[PDB]
Design an enzyme around this catalytic site. Structure first.
Site, PDB file in Angstrom:
ATOM      1  N   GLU A  12       0.829  -1.197   0.000  1.00 37.27           N
ATOM      2  CA  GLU A  12       0.000   0.000   0.000  1.00 37.27           C
ATOM      3  C   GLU A  12       0.866   1.251   0.000  1.00 37.27           C
ATOM      4  OE1 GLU A  12      -2.098   0.502   3.613  1.00 37.27           O
ATOM      5  OE2 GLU A  12      -3.054   2.384   3.020  1.00 37.27           O
ATOM      6  N   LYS A  36      -9.402   3.244  -2.361  1.00 32.18           N
ATOM      7  CA  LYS A  36      -9.830   2.782  -1.048  1.00 32.18           C
ATOM      8  C   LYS A  36     -11.132   3.463  -0.649  1.00 32.18           C
ATOM      9  CE  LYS A  36      -8.180   2.059   3.666  1.00 32.18           C
ATOM     10  NZ  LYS A  36      -7.123   2.363   4.665  1.00 32.18           N
ATOM     11  N   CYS A  84      -5.576  -2.694   2.976  1.00 29.34           N
ATOM     12  CA  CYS A  84      -5.305  -2.696   4.441  1.00 29.34           C
ATOM     13  C   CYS A  84      -6.530  -3.098   5.202  1.00 29.34           C
ATOM     14  CB  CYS A  84      -4.821  -1.334   4.933  1.00 29.34           C
ATOM     15  SG  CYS A  84      -4.676  -1.330   6.711  1.00 29.34           S
TER      16      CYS A  84
HETATM   17  C1  LIG Z   1     -15.604   7.675  20.641  1.00 27.17           C
HETATM   18  C2  LIG Z   1     -15.099   6.669  19.615  1.00 27.17           C
HETATM   19  C3  LIG Z   1     -13.571   6.616  19.518  1.00 27.17           C
HETATM   20  C4  LIG Z   1     -12.919   6.641  20.908  1.00 27.17           C
HETATM   21  C5  LIG Z   1     -11.527   7.268  20.937  1.00 27.17           C
HETATM   22  C6  LIG Z   1     -10.547   6.801  19.838  1.00 27.17           C
HETATM   23  C7  LIG Z   1      -9.065   7.049  20.128  1.00 27.17           C
HETATM   24  C8  LIG Z   1      -8.084   6.641  19.009  1.00 27.17           C
HETATM   25  C9  LIG Z   1      -8.778   6.412  17.697  1.00 27.17           C
HETATM   26  C10 LIG Z   1      -8.158   6.469  16.516  1.00 27.17           C
HETATM   27  C11 LIG Z   1      -6.699   6.769  16.343  1.00 27.17           C
HETATM   28  C12 LIG Z   1      -5.988   5.771  15.409  1.00 27.17           C
HETATM   29  C13 LIG Z   1      -5.293   6.430  14.211  1.00 27.17           C
HETATM   30  C14 LIG Z   1      -4.248   5.525  13.551  1.00 27.17           C
HETATM   31  C15 LIG Z   1      -3.859   5.941  12.127  1.00 27.17           C
HETATM   32  C16 LIG Z   1      -3.743   4.765  11.146  1.00 27.17           C
HETATM   33  C17 LIG Z   1      -4.108   5.185   9.727  1.00 27.17           C
HETATM   34  C18 LIG Z   1      -3.018   5.164   8.695  1.00 27.17           C
HETATM   35  O1  LIG Z   1      -2.117   5.985   8.673  1.00 27.17           O
HETATM   36  O2  LIG Z   1      -3.077   4.167   7.770  1.00 27.17           O
HETATM   37  C19 LIG Z   1      -1.883   3.851   7.062  1.00 27.17           C
HETATM   38  C20 LIG Z   1      -1.692   2.316   7.188  1.00 27.17           C
HETATM   39  O3  LIG Z   1      -1.542   1.831   5.882  1.00 27.17           O
HETATM   40  C21 LIG Z   1      -2.063   4.258   5.571  1.00 27.17           C
HETATM   41  O4  LIG Z   1      -0.933   3.857   4.895  1.00 27.17           O
HETATM   42  P1  LIG Z   1       0.406   4.886   4.748  1.00 27.17           P
HETATM   43  O5  LIG Z   1       0.765   4.871   3.299  1.00 27.17           O
HETATM   44  O6  LIG Z   1       1.299   4.514   5.886  1.00 27.17           O
HETATM   45  O7  LIG Z   1      -0.261   6.383   5.107  1.00 27.17           O
HETATM   46  C22 LIG Z   1       0.301   7.278   5.987  1.00 27.17           C
HETATM   47  C23 LIG Z   1      -0.818   8.196   6.546  1.00 27.17           C
HETATM   48  N1  LIG Z   1      -1.155   9.299   5.643  1.00 27.17           N
END
Ligand SMILES: CCCCCCCC/C=C\CCCCCCCC(=O)O[C@@H](CO)COP(=O)(O)OCCN
Length: 510
Positions: free
Chosen positions: A267, A335, A387
């Site tokens: 990816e 995606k 992913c």
């Molecule tokens: C109230 C409901 C929720 C409760 C609180 C929630 C707290 C935490 C929730 C969410 C935080 C998690 C965020 C993680 C990010 C993962 C996404 C991502 O970066 O994906 C990559 C994996 O592949 C996309 O690929 P890349 O090429 O590496 O892209 C680089 C990015 N432009």
């Protein structure tokens, strides 16, 4: 020490709910102890016996917190590398995420004890599987959903794997909850009759694992090569690394041309925009056609919309033989299910400034179509899923078509970390191959790059965290599983029939 009176205490059951909940983490890929799925689900239903609805809700919440507090604790790594928030703040979000996901398990146990207070077979075998189906659906649907740690994926190699091609993984969730409740009923109330029913219901789907809903096609066997680039996440998005990233993938691909019919890159392997890499892609496309090889690679594309606007997509593009490259070609997969807080702002309320503020580059992606045509590469139909999308069994099935040769997924599991994270994602990917009876071609940046057989077995695999190429011969399969034909509706009919029957008895019994 007086367990009869000790177990009656609410605090004791809350403590045991954490232990039984955390025991369910052992059922998944890094540990593969599938009996722990039954033990964990037996503690969810035995501890909620003879409890008030609010007390049972707290027990269900603690059981969920134990499962999600130890099962998706790897989210801390993804939060740590995103936004750069302080350590105490990152720990709070992981607890908040685990607490949020535990509401549905708390909701399940609260409603289960509200409508079916009595510890009967109806509560554990009829009401619980139907209510578990509804609450697990809500967990995977509300707020873009997060259907992680479903015990059906623990049966990828277990006795219940044969039920997946027929009714799906969610049916294994339905049966595991039914069997565990009967075992809990047979244990809390000393009675072998629910014990025999649980064993019979568990042993009935065992012969189903020997049914092949697919036909191998040796005449169409190819050599597929997946390049595990192993690009560090910190340096993945940098101007200087752009040349190095392209050089690493190209150098590992040049020997593969001609020998490998299909070549797969992870990816966002090409971190630059698709429009910014036209001379590179055109030259790469021409070279692949000369040696009769086709490349399927991930890339970020910011396509200009009709109204002078850019919509950024996480795309998979195809090059080489059987798929000439062009920027306007429809032979691409965008995606659709974006990762919350990593690719879009949920609900875009006010988009107020915060500490992360989309610190990670490319955090404002758009959504592709829910149903997209399969990728074509050297006369091969591939059902793509980037992913996280591979764990959405219903979305993959909807995109699945009878002429699909392989299931394709490209991921960057560096965000999952270096822990149980990538393995849990990998196990859910293996279920798609089992449900749809198609070989799965999984290519990752540094995660678990593997080829999964049509029955879910790991045909080939390479170690993580290394720069290596997985080259192997994979054979396409043909034929539709009952799950591919129908989907989840036969299980929702069963859930409705079990739910309607259980609710009627609840209303009948005051
Ligand atoms: C109230 C409901 C929720 C409760 C609180 C929630 C707290 C935490 C929730 C969410 C935080 C998690 C965020 C993680 C990010 C993962 C996404 C991502 O970066 O994906 C990559 C994996 O592949 C996309 O690929 P890349 O090429 O590496 O892209 C680089 C990015 N432009």
């Amino acid at each position: 020490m007086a367990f009869a009176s000790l177990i009656e205490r609410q605090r004791i059951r809350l403590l045991l709910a954490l232990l039984f909940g955390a025991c369910g983490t052992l059922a998944f890929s890094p540990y593969d102890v599938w009996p722990a799925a039954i033990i964990s689900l037996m503690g969810l239903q035995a501890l909620t016996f003879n409890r008030r609805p609010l007390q049972s809700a707290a027990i269900g919440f603690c059981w969920g917190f134990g499962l999600f507090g130890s099962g998706i604790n790897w989210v801390y790594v993804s939060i740590a590398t995103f936004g750069g928030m302080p350590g105490p703040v990152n720990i709070f979000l992981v607890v908040l995420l685990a607490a949020y996901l535990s509401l549905y398990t708390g909701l399940f146990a609260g409603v289960l004890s509200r409508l079916w207070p009595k510890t009967t077979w109806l509560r554990v075998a009829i009401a619980a599987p139907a209510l578990w189906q509804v609450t697990e659906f809500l967990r995977g649907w509300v707020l873009t959903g997060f259907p992680w740690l479903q015990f059906g994926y623990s049966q990828i190699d277990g006795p219940l794997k044969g039920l997946a091609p027929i009714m799906g993984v969610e049916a294994i969730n339905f049966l595991l909850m039914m069997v565990s409740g009967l075992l809990a009923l047979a244990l809390v109330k000393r009675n072998w009759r629910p014990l025999v029913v649980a064993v019979v219901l568990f042993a009935l789907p065992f012969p189903l694992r020997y049914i092949q809903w697919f036909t191998p096609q040796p005449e169409k066997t190819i050599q597929v090569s997946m390049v595990q680039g192993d690009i560090p996440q910190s340096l993945k998005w940098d101007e200087g690394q752009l040349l190095n990233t392209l050089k690493i993938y190209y150098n590992a691909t040049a020997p593969l041309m001609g020998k490998s019919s299909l070549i797969i890159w992870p990816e966002s392997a090409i971190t630059d925009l698709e429009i910014n890499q036209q001379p590179f892609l055109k030259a790469l496309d021409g070279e692949l056609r000369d040696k009769g090889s086709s490349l399927v690679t991930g890339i970020v594309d910011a396509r200009l919309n009709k109204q002078n606007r850019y919509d950024t997509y996480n795309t998979i593009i195809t090059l080489g033989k059987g798929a000439p490259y062009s920027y306007e070609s429809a032979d691409r997969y965008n995606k659709n299910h974006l990762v919350p807080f990593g690719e879009f702002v949920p609900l875009e309320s006010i988009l107020r400034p915060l500490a992360p503020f989309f610190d990670l580059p490319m955090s404002s992606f758009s959504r592709g179509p829910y149903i997209q045509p399969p990728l074509s590469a050297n006369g091969i139909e591939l059902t793509a899923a980037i992913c996280y999308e591979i764990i959405l069994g219903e979305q993959v099935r909807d995109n699945f078509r009878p002429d699909t040769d392989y299931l394709l997924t490209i991921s960057n599991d560096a965000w999952f970390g270096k822990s149980i994270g990538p393995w849990q994602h990998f196990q859910m990917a293996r279920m798609r191959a089992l449900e749809l009876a198609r070989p799965l071609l999984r290519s990752t940046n540094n995660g678990i790059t593997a080829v999964i057989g049509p029955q879910g077995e790991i045909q080939a695999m390479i170690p993580q965290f290394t720069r290596e190429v997985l080259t192997t011969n994979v054979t396409p399969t043909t034929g539709l599983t009952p799950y591919a034909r129908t989907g989840n509706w036969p299980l929702w009919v069963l859930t409705a029939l079990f739910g309607f029957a259980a609710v009627l008895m609840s209303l009948r019994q005051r």
